[PDB]
Amino acid sequence: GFKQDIATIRGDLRTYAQDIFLAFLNKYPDERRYFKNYVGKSDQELKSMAKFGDHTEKWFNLMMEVADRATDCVPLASDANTLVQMKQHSSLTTGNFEKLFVALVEYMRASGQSFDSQSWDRFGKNLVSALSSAGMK
């Protein structure tokens, strides 16, 4: 279930974080414009770039921290507020996060794995509600 998926992802967090981030960019290619250093780079070139692995891991580590602090996939409002207040997210809207989760859930459903994708969909929906209510436009 969901708690197991957090363990699965954490176990190989680098690989999962990069995999899922690329899936997000491939499903919604216009989203690459928020990551100016990744424009025009192949996947292999991106994995050669220190900030690519580092920032993506750190993104999914916080994702897992928020997932683990949730109760039945409902995130803390304090965690949603962190995500809204981050300088790196100042020009985001809830639509950016809805896209990420659509891609995340599609990735889980396509994998050789046994993720509880329905719960990740619900967590995404609940986090999007909490972002909007913490003031994300």
Next chain:
Amino acid sequence: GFKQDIATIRGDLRTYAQDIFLAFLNKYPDERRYFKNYVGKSDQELKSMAKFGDHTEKWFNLMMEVADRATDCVPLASDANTLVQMKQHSSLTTGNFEKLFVALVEYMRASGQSFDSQSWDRFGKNLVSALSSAGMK
């Protein structure tokens, strides 16, 4: 994105090149007049002809190099000049290229693979603008 799509095509070039070229001749059957020996033939018949796979791979080998030497889907002028000046292209106008790109983009949109089809549409239009700049009618 675009850069990764070049690597994806290159990973199974023969198949993608023949798939896309066939999509082009089937959408635009009129275009067979520019070629020798292709009229009167089903897809599987073309695929078994001595020269079909080889020439289509040569076309897409170079198209991938032109895509790869581009910056932000804008091809090099010297690559455009090459294409305009090739003797094999002496009877072409930019409309032939526009039709190829229409078919390429529709093929990507229909495929199971996650191509950045909007980027290929931009690349096709930048390439036709570059052909015109290089003097193709």
